[PDB]
Ligand binder design. Sequence first.
Ligand SMILES: *[C@@H]1O[C@H](CO[C@@H]2O[C@@H](C)[C@@H](O)[C@@H](O)[C@@H]2O)[C@@H](O[C@@H]2O[C@H](CO)[C@@H](O[C@@H]3O[C@H](CO[C@H]4O[C@H](CO)[C@@H](O)[C@H](O)[C@@H]4O)[C@@H](O)[C@H](O[C@H]4O[C@H](CO)[C@@H](O)[C@H](O)[C@@H]4O)[C@@H]3O)[C@H](O)[C@H]2NC(C)=O)[C@H](O)[C@H]1NC(C)=O
Ligand SMILES: *[C@@H]1O[C@H](CO)[C@@H](O[C@@H]2O[C@H](CO)[C@@H](O[C@@H]3O[C@H](CO[C@H]4O[C@H](CO)[C@@H](O)[C@H](O)[C@@H]4O)[C@@H](O)[C@H](O[C@H]4O[C@H](CO)[C@@H](O)[C@H](O)[C@@H]4O)[C@@H]3O)[C@H](O)[C@H]2NC(C)=O)[C@H](O)[C@H]1NC(C)=O
Ligand SMILES: *[C@@H]1O[C@H](CO)[C@@H](O[C@@H]2O[C@H](CO)[C@@H](O[C@@H]3O[C@H](CO)[C@@H](O)[C@H](O)[C@@H]3O)[C@H](O)[C@H]2NC(C)=O)[C@H](O)[C@H]1NC(C)=O
Ligand SMILES: *[C@@H]1O[C@H](CO)[C@@H](O[C@@H]2O[C@H](CO)[C@@H](O[C@@H]3O[C@H](CO)[C@@H](O)[C@H](O)[C@@H]3O)[C@H](O)[C@H]2NC(C)=O)[C@H](O)[C@H]1NC(C)=O
Ligand SMILES: *[C@@H]1O[C@H](CO)[C@@H](O[C@@H]2O[C@H](CO)[C@@H](O[C@@H]3O[C@H](CO)[C@@H](O)[C@H](O)[C@@H]3O)[C@H](O)[C@H]2NC(C)=O)[C@H](O)[C@H]1NC(C)=O
Ligand SMILES: *[C@@H]1O[C@H](CO)[C@@H](O[C@@H]2O[C@H](CO)[C@@H](O[C@@H]3O[C@H](CO)[C@@H](O)[C@H](O)[C@@H]3O)[C@H](O)[C@H]2NC(C)=O)[C@H](O)[C@H]1NC(C)=O
Ligand SMILES: *[C@@H]1O[C@H](CO)[C@@H](O)[C@H](O)[C@H]1NC(C)=O
Ligand SMILES: *[C@@H]1O[C@H](CO)[C@@H](O)[C@H](O)[C@H]1NC(C)=O
Ligand SMILES: [Zn+2]
Length: 616
Amino acid sequence: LDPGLQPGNFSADEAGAQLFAQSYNSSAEQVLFQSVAASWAHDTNITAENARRQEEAALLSQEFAEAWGQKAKELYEPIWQNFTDPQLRRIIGAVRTLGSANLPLAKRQQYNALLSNMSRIYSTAKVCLPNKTATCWSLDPDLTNILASSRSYAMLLFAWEGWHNAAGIPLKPLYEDFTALSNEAYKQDGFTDTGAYWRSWYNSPTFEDDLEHLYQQLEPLYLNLHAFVRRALHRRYGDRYINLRGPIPAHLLGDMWAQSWENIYDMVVPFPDKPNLDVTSTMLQQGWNATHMFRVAEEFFTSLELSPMPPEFWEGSMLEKPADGREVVCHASAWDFYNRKDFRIKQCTRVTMDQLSTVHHEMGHIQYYLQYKDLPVSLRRGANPGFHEAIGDVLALSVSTPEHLHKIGLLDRVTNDTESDINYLLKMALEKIAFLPFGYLVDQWRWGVFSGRTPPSRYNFDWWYLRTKYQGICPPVTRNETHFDAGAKFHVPNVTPYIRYFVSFVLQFQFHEALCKEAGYEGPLHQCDIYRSTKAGAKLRKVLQAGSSRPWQEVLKDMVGLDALDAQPLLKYFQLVTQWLQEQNQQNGEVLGWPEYQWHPPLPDNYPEGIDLVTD
Ligand SMILES: *[C@@H]1O[C@H](CO[C@@H]2O[C@@H](C)[C@@H](O)[C@@H](O)[C@@H]2O)[C@@H](O[C@@H]2O[C@H](CO)[C@@H](O[C@@H]3O[C@H](CO[C@H]4O[C@H](CO)[C@@H](O)[C@H](O)[C@@H]4O)[C@@H](O)[C@H](O[C@H]4O[C@H](CO)[C@@H](O)[C@H](O)[C@@H]4O)[C@@H]3O)[C@H](O)[C@H]2NC(C)=O)[C@H](O)[C@H]1NC(C)=O
Ligand SMILES: *[C@@H]1O[C@H](CO)[C@@H](O[C@@H]2O[C@H](CO)[C@@H](O[C@@H]3O[C@H](CO[C@H]4O[C@H](CO)[C@@H](O)[C@H](O)[C@@H]4O)[C@@H](O)[C@H](O[C@H]4O[C@H](CO)[C@@H](O)[C@H](O)[C@@H]4O)[C@@H]3O)[C@H](O)[C@H]2NC(C)=O)[C@H](O)[C@H]1NC(C)=O
Ligand SMILES: *[C@@H]1O[C@H](CO)[C@@H](O[C@@H]2O[C@H](CO)[C@@H](O[C@@H]3O[C@H](CO)[C@@H](O)[C@H](O)[C@@H]3O)[C@H](O)[C@H]2NC(C)=O)[C@H](O)[C@H]1NC(C)=O
Ligand SMILES: *[C@@H]1O[C@H](CO)[C@@H](O[C@@H]2O[C@H](CO)[C@@H](O[C@@H]3O[C@H](CO)[C@@H](O)[C@H](O)[C@@H]3O)[C@H](O)[C@H]2NC(C)=O)[C@H](O)[C@H]1NC(C)=O
Ligand SMILES: *[C@@H]1O[C@H](CO)[C@@H](O[C@@H]2O[C@H](CO)[C@@H](O[C@@H]3O[C@H](CO)[C@@H](O)[C@H](O)[C@@H]3O)[C@H](O)[C@H]2NC(C)=O)[C@H](O)[C@H]1NC(C)=O
Ligand SMILES: *[C@@H]1O[C@H](CO)[C@@H](O[C@@H]2O[C@H](CO)[C@@H](O[C@@H]3O[C@H](CO)[C@@H](O)[C@H](O)[C@@H]3O)[C@H](O)[C@H]2NC(C)=O)[C@H](O)[C@H]1NC(C)=O
Ligand SMILES: *[C@@H]1O[C@H](CO)[C@@H](O)[C@H](O)[C@H]1NC(C)=O
Ligand SMILES: *[C@@H]1O[C@H](CO)[C@@H](O)[C@H](O)[C@H]1NC(C)=O
Ligand SMILES: [Zn+2]
């Protein structure tokens, strides 16, 4: 048994715990490196050969965590909370979390394979017309593309139900057992249930209470936005299917999960005549190419006097669709090998304005890793799990502005037209604000499941109850206790929390408002840029530098000034769209909210016979 993989002898003392932690850090980064190294190899070079390695390196990592966790859990758990330095408590607290590993091996297999099956079913789920069609439609491209692009209610419904039938129905039996074993494992760790464990990451004694108050402060913005989309859908589909006072059919909102309303912008766009300024056409004539795009992004960070990329980045990063033509996970991602000496971005970059914005986002993560690279490995993560995304986003917000684009040189004049930016801001409002209630209700639901507030006979009653109460949606078809629509969202059977994204979105604008205030800027917040503001850069740098050492709330108070999340900065960013929508809503007499919730559409006249009929 490798000494580099198994812990030694240590007393229950802080001096012992310090020695143990230090030993954990040294071996831990070694282990993490191997796992990610093969991961990067396969992800950058898609082949079954590397997949076998990826599986092997990840397997080793768990045995490592079990060895150290095993010793830690037995050794300090009776005393650990008393260690003086919170720094030490944080490291030990992370390692002492064993999770599933606690299960006896017979249950481990049952729990582990079970999780594997849930993932298979979701990705495997196939939706087939009630005809012996030669080939069915998978989640993407066909199902997502047809649902995002199609606008024939009859057609759109059938695709939506088919997905929930195929994905949802088979997960329901399995998910109960996962609930049983998952909570069983965490009980041995010391959490009342899986929910208590997920909430534990934010170190907020009133965490769930905090979110409700945040969400109630955003609801005025959401209801106004919801009312406007409801009206627009009514113009397109007709009163038979959109009750001005009631909830919106879930399948008509432009995406399989109604989590993003981005695809309906074409119907709702204010001031439809102003074109969205796309710099692609100028970018091409400028001779720019993917490789230069990244150095352009670095220049922005250098303007913020943050750390410029290490040469290791230019060497490692997989900036393009490789000319070798070997397969790659072209979906852009940012990687940090816990090896202090390197960090890499995988973009598969192609020259579009969107990717320019995307590259800035990804480079923000790299910047984030570099600033806390000095901390011990257990702390080299976001201040809170949602904190990581927020930093990446705020950087992306600043660069999207035409004010910034002119500074880079891609634009001759910064036309200060309110119709142009409202057009833009509404697309963002459809893209992300519509997401908040959804991101909140999924983890709102899951804590209920793990907590038992939703016993098994209610998996679907509560999901639609919650989904309607918060998001303002009801199902396209009456659905009952045989179903398990929770299983229809990727994050559910893959057991990945959603709350991180909701909290991240509030933190995104909360940081943004802080930097603008630091940058001496004034007036419209959505016209703010942090470029060249070194004094703001130092403030941002501080928040990154702390990593996970300091409790997330304590750091946030130093940055923005408030010990907790708040909606006020987010609202100010959207002040213009808030003002404009209310007038549009006020004129039409929209009922803000959704009384008479117990209303939903009739079925299509010949459903499912009429599902392919031309209606455009
Ligand atoms: C991605 O784009 C990279 C950026 O290219 C620059 O920016 C774009 C927007 C255009 O304006 C382009 O014309 C720019 O060069 C690109 O890197 C560039 O690659 C080109 C070749 O494709 C290189 O051209 C050579 O440049 C040198 C001079 O550059 C050095 O010195 C100047 C100062 O004098 C510095 O400002 C530079 O930064 C460099 O340090 C020339 O000596 C050489 O001249 C040759 O041609 C002329 C006739 O035109 C002859 O008289 C000479 O004798 C030579 O035969 C080349 O013109 C360029 O160096 C390089 N940029 C930089 C900054 O080094 C990259 O290739 C693109 N990548 C991909 C994958 O597409
Ligand atoms: C978590 O675990 C890892 C692994 O143990 C620790 O990583 C080490 O971090 C230290 C610094 O904290 C690194 O030390 C640096 O080494 C450089 C030389 O490296 C070469 O030489 C050594 C042998 O001497 C070889 O082993 C190595 O492979 C290289 O060939 C120095 O140049 C550095 O100088 C800096 O520090 C000195 C003081 O030490 C200053 O006076 C200088 O001004 C300069 O700032 C430095 O000494 C070490 O290399 C890292 N090892 C690994 C494997 O990454 C983490 O630090 C640890 N986390 C915590 C919180 O302890
Ligand atoms: C941590 O230190 C402990 C000692 O406090 C080490 O445990 C001891 O390890 C040795 C082998 O390395 C074991 O030896 C065996 O002892 C039995 C009698 O106990 C004897 O009959 C055998 O022939 C053999 O000599 C010993 O049992 C074991 N004792 C205990 C209490 O664990 C341990 O190796 C150290 N662990 C690490 C990770 O460094
Ligand atoms: C993408 O991943 C695959 C799998 O890891 C890599 O394929 C392997 O590449 C090496 C050389 O690049 C091959 O080794 C060579 O094989 C020949 C024939 O036996 C031998 O004459 C050489 O001496 C050397 O051993 C290897 O066989 C090949 N395949 C496998 C399964 O390992 C590929 O290189 C990766 N591409 C990139 C760009 O990283
Ligand atoms: C995850 O899903 C797979 C697929 O449903 C499960 O594997 C299957 O598990 C069952 C028993 O749990 C095996 O049943 C056996 O089938 C053979 C005929 O194939 C029959 O002769 C035996 O009497 C028995 O009924 C089935 O073979 C097995 N399939 C494979 C490919 O191994 C797996 O058990 C599921 N995991 C969990 C935790 O539910
Ligand atoms: C939950 O509600 C679902 C409806 O979404 C009910 O499932 C449906 O149940 C009916 C019968 O109760 C099924 O129709 C029957 O089909 C056969 C031919 O297959 C026909 O001969 C009968 O006359 C009748 O039309 C329907 O296929 C079935 N659909 C699904 C998706 O299950 C279910 O009964 C409800 N369950 C509970 C516990 O309330
Ligand atoms: C330390 O132990 C004492 C005595 O059991 C207990 O009162 C105290 O709460 C512990 N410290 C922490 C931080 O829980
Ligand atoms: C655009 O015009 C408004 C007029 O009130 C002004 O407040 C805003 O600062 C202007 N933006 C820029 C970038 O000049
Ligand atoms: Zn990101």
